[PDB]
Design a protein around this ligand. Structure first.
Ligand SMILES: CCCCCCCCCCCCCCCCCCCC(=O)O[C@H](COC(=O)CCCCCCCCCCCCCC)COP(=O)(O)OCCN
Ligand SMILES: CCCCCCCCCCCCCCCCCCCC(=O)O[C@H](COC(=O)CCCCCCCCCCCCCC)COP(=O)(O)OCCN
Ligand SMILES: [K+]
Ligand SMILES: [K+]
Ligand SMILES: [K+]
Ligand SMILES: [K+]
Ligand SMILES: [K+]
Lengths: 439, 450, 439, 450
């Protein structure tokens, strides 16, 4: 029986009903403003759309709900039906009665009863509430789409109401439209619609050419309220667009402040130009490494250590399988290794470590390649550097120079000593499998 | 999973009367309605009318009577002085402060216009304009509401903006009509150039036409059907247009302030979640792993949000009540199970000040069987099972400590079945805690040992 | 000889010349747009103003300048004259030649030569630069005054240029003004001015009634550029007004976030309602204590310890003179006392400490009064509480209850013990002068 | 004093060519000028002209020739791949990437219109509109300038806004004229309703009239002299007015962003200074004392600003060059006087890593005679005297250490005579530093002892 929310076969039905809501949002004000009585084709199409919402009146029984008081999805048919009968079953139901039936109770009913069908706009508000949570869509741009919809619906409604004020008048002259057009009745419905839409947008944007304007007090009262609504709407629009701009441009501002800080530091302390250019080159690479190294380390430093470890195991243990200088070591020691290892990125043609430097650290190349340097040999992907210096505790035997954008795992001798004070018997495998690379 | 949990986290992200008396605040709230009345009627009497007439005269005298009652009653209402923060109830001091401030303006704002018009017949409208002194009461009300936690700041500010713009529209409409009505020739006026005999038309039509012009100008729609015809009208409209420029910039500044204010914390959350999303996408992590890390990241954000609020609300606060608060917290957050019964106050403080609160997702496992006893927990709220199941775990219940204080690998796995809050303690810090006054630690061991 | 900048007698002269700049800013575009040849009174008044600026051409010799490369004011007559002759002496000089003399070189010179006098606006920009630094004036509101000036000057200039475009035309009809007015020449100069000012503001505010608008291509080109300038100006105005609003309202937002944080903390941990009301009462008092306790402690915690000490000596040593329980102690020990003392504020009817509490701290009342409590005695201004408990190290003998908004200095026993391990022989005066209050 | 110091602080607050070759960047910068030409001419040929004519045809063929040269030359220009950050110089890879991306669009954007018009005579204006593909080069230029430290971000953004709004105005003017010129009756058009025979008027007059309408509409001034007369013009203007609403909101959003961005750090300074100002005012501090504390507060703000920049620029940076930077700093910030000559590397590091930099006002005293030797300093820059005077103190000079390493009350007062920067060391931390490898500390004592 009870269908889950978040069922994909249900999500496509709700998305379909939203396009029938967009149809309703256009048709209902137009039928209110421009039409007197039901006519083909619009009558049969509206009855078709009412059939789809009448199906939904039933199919919203048998659908569960997330009770956020307990964070579980309720599947009890007695509870879901009781909740729906309380939650606006009657408004949905009345919004689906045919206009023919709803006007046998009174012939004047047509336009104003069809305006009740704007109740369906609750579904558009619900869709925006979903998209403002779903991380697959940008939040500020979904707010933009929401504000575009509100604007277009306002322009359409105002056009239909203001035409109705003219069309109901006892004289076609002395109306805003009949003041310009000799007889706007007995003129094409498209031309009357476009003329009203033109007036409406001309007013909402405050261009106000003044070819079309209020001629009588009823028109003036309507336009007074429409102009006051437009002042609030535009101030809201400019607020939201400012927020969209301010947060969208933030990356470039932060990058420039970072480079400005480094440049000022170099100019205060009078760093040598070579090393200054290396500092800026690494900061630029960090900004261009957003999708990898940046959002990697900006995530991993937050995670609880259990899942953090499981990530490191997924991501790098297959690299630890490549290094002969750990072959057959105890599994826990190699897990500890990847749990301690930092990860870093280097530009091309940079020294990671120089010859005759003290062995404070060692590295494993994840990807990219480097030269020991004059040149003696090449370092592959899945290959290790500096470790014999960390073992020996004597100065490093060669400079290692990047020749690609290169990713390296890193460890420090002070913690490697501590790691070797763990697993002390497995340290014999460390020793032997170094000695057999040393042979 | 995951999505609905982070959605929830985003959703969470002798005769003196006191001025605080409810009966007095109902009276003050009533008088603000008569201020809104005054704000409409005084410009209208200045613009459109030349002598007092029914119903407006009798209604104004009724309103003046309510304000005259207030002129009396405010001699019997105390005030608080910023030197002492006590309410002053000395009749002489209440009288002196009222006389020295606002009594005279309140008095002239209350004299009947039918009396003032015996001083001169030209006085009527311009004397009515003095009643706008009463607007101080609306400014006072908004100042209270803006700093009151019961009221939504967004809607209080919006109400302020709406009142300012409506009052500006109304005043400009009345002044611009007065410039037309007081002219020597009606046909050379902004209104008589359109309506050939406007002085014969209904007062409603003239008002609506003036409001229409005023709003058309302030919104800058400016259809141009109605516009300045003569030099007086041009000078007036020059200053009105300048004012409207400043007012529009103020309205947009306030709406921008409101939307960046209200969005800020949701933005701060989104950045962390979308960073983790981009990481998981780019490194091609399995979906089965991804939603576990997104769930934990959302619940860490929830945890430290509450921690910062506790810190910033305690470390601001004088040592006396900071003591009382931290005392109550220590003596009420702990003691959640009989294993602690008889714990000494020092051992209590050392434990409860070091335990770390955290939130844990539904349908997940907090500790695992036969693992080393690195940590133990107290369940604050939510529900879990010891696990096949052996029993349910309640709120006000514990896991893992039976392996920690006497060293054993953990006897059970434990699995959540609602969103759950726990207090963690790690064995290394627990050992340091138990090393304080060790005898009491032995009494806890006796509570466990059976 | 050389007069200093920041001499008050010079600052009043520069402020006077700024009002003559405001005169120039109105008169020069008006003479350019509306007048053909020099006429009384405006000719004699302009010659008077030129005399004041000609005095300044001389009096700007003999005035020093702050050389911000070395942060000293230069007094060398050879340097100040050399700097001035380089720095725009010639533009100031040409801006003071009389219009009569400057039009004997050519009769058409009058209007366009008088436009050169807008060079004097450099002085208004300099005044705003000063006021944007002087802490006696609000920064955002000085930016507002700057933007009002720019707006009013733009409206005036545009009105004068657009009238000149009409007045130079070969036909009065086919001009924006002669299209409405049958003959605008031979009409009052005030009416022509007001008509132009009206058109100008109607356009800059974008109301655009359209009674007055460009009739010919020269007018259209001018209005094209004016409308493009106004779009930038209004967007700048709205930016600056937003910044003014955002920073001006910040106090209320921070207060509400503080109270919301405390309210949520109480609702999470389920604090008892009495103590919850005390917590909010103290946070409210802190916000209302902005000018004293807040900006006091928000300043003192920053200051370098030497000046911080000198402040404490100025502010509270005269209170330390009142306490008999330190009479005749070594001066250094009492300075150490005031250097250690914190300062705090309490609402009326609050316990600072209760009876039978442990003696962790003691206090001295700066102002306000309190009861020992049932009641036994009253505590004055310049009076001490809790110290016998800190001496005895046994629970406090009475509750002390505020009966005003009260300010107290505070110390903690752990640091008072350390302070008594300093000055150990002067501790004998502490002991004896307690024992003689204990008698 | 004081005021000018805080004012200063506020003022401070085989055949491949590389794409980085200066000769190539001059060529690319030249082609952007021909893009601005194309952006004007293509809408104008679409709106106002029906067949190619001098001078415009010959000028367009000259511009097409420069782009055809670029279509060739871009086969000889390398690119950098984001996988390796090396420049690719393989001729086959350069060719393939260019063919696989933009060669075809660059080619059709270069065919002479006098050739395309042999395919059909109606093609002319609509084929010219395809040349607007070239605008990608302007978008690329702005993307470079926005992230380039040599260029002011404010003016680069303003230039972007000005170009977008000018191009929108121009395009709308040309399209709206085309709607009029292509109508069956000129008198029923937005322009022919005003100018009875506009097709006889000069091309300049028609262009200026169309630009005037376009700007009047986009700025929303809307005089209404020129407006839509027929249904086609109304539909066009409906969509133009909607677009202008979005564009205006974007312009105001960018200007707000720019002014809050540029003001932020001055705001952050002002708050600290005005807090201290309000404190000194309310507590009635003497002016003689006040300006001393305001001076020190301004120079502390200056000091810690530079400290945060050093931290955030070092702790971001890989350990190799972080080492090189900190190494150079340690070996160059110290050794400022002969008292340190022969200092050991460990004692050097322990000292220089712990010394604290600070700024000190003019005409003030850093240490006083016969006071206890609590601290000593190295002068980094500025000037002072030992004090009556006994001698000047240089940059690269020291004060007070002669009382610290051998314990004595300080021999002199010392007084600044310019704004001065010093490195402090406190005797307690100095003792801890000297307790590392004490023999080297004795060699420093031998350097002082004579
Ligand atoms: C920098 C850009 C510069 C742009 C260019 C300018 C060019 C020169 C021209 C300058 C023109 C400037 C004109 C003024 C601009 C608008 C100023 C609005 C000020 C304002 O609203 O103040 C608030 C009024 O609050 C209140 O409490 C008011 C209460 C009013 C109650 C009225 C009740 C009316 C009822 C009847 C209505 C009429 C009948 C309708 C049918 C005060 O508070 P605050 O905002 O400062 O907040 C507290 C701080 N955060
Ligand atoms: C939320 C509020 C919603 C309001 C209500 C809306 C109601 C519905 C209607 C919606 C209408 C929306 C219409 C679009 C709005 C404006 C969009 C502007 C977008 C834009 O400018 O993008 C920039 C163009 O940059 C460029 O690089 C462009 C370069 C162009 C060069 C042109 C050269 C022209 C030379 C010739 C001129 C003509 C002759 C003049 C005599 C891209 O960059 P970015 O800003 O994103 O920056 C990078 C991120 N930070
Ligand atoms: K307008
Ligand atoms: K108009
Ligand atoms: K018009
Ligand atoms: K407008
Ligand atoms: K208009």
């Amino acid at each position: 029986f009870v269908v889950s929310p978040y069922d994909h076969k249900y999500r496509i039905w709700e998305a379909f009903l939203v396009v029938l809501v967009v149809y309703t949002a256009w048709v209902s004000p137009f039928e209110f403003g421009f039409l007197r009585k039901p006519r083909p084709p619009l009558s049969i199409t509206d009855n078709i759309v009412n059939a789809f919402f009448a199906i939904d009146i039933i199919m919203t029984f048998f659908v569960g709900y997330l009770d956020k008081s307990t964070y579980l999805i309720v599947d009890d048919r007695k509870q879901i039906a009781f909740k729906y009968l309380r939650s606006w079953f009657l408004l949905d139901l009345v919004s689906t009665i045919p206009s023919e039936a709803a006007m046998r109770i009174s012939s004047q009913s047509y336009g104003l009863f069809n305006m009740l069908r704007l109740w369906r706009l609750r579904r558009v508000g619900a869709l925006f509430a979903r998209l403002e949570k779903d991380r697959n869509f940008n939040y500020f741009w979904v707010r933009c789409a929401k504000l575009v919809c509100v604007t277009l619906f306002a322009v359409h409604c105002a056009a239909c109401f203001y035409y109705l004020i003219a069309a109901r008048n006892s004289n076609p002259a002395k109306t805003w439209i009949g003041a310009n057009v000799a007889n706007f009745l007995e003129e094409s419905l498209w031309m009357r619609y476009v003329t009203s839409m033109y007036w409406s947008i001309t007013t909402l944007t405050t261009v106000g050419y003044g070819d079309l304007h209020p001629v009588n007090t009823k028109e003036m009262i309507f336009d007074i309220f429409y102009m006051l609504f437009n002042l609030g709407l535009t101030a809201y629009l400019i607020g939201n667009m400012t927020n969209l701009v301010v947060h969208g441009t933030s990356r470039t501002r932060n990058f420039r402040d970072t480079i400005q800080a480094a440049s000022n530091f170099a100019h205060r302390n009078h760093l040598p130009p070579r090393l200054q250019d290396q500092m800026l080159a690494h900061l630029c690479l960090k900004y261009r490494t957003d999708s990898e190294g940046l959002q990697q380390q900006e995530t991993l430093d937050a995670l609880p250590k259990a899942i953090r470890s499981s990530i490191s195991h997924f991501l790098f243990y297959s690299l630890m399988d490549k290094v002969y200088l750990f072959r057959g070591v105890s599994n826990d020691l190699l897990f500890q290794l990847v749990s301690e290892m930092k990860a870093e990125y280097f530009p091309p043609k940079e020294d990671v470590i120089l010859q005759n430097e003290a062995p404070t650290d060692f590295y494993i190349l994840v990807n990219g390649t480097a030269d020991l340097v004059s040149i003696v040999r090449e370092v592959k992907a899945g290959d290790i550097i500096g470790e014999i210096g960390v073992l020996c505790y004597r100065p490093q035997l060669f400079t290692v120079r990047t020749k690609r954008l290169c990713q390296l795992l890193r460890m420090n001798r002070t913690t490697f000593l501590n790691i070797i004070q763990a697993n002390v018997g497995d340290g014999t495998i460390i020793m032997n499998n170094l000695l057999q690379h040393l042979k």
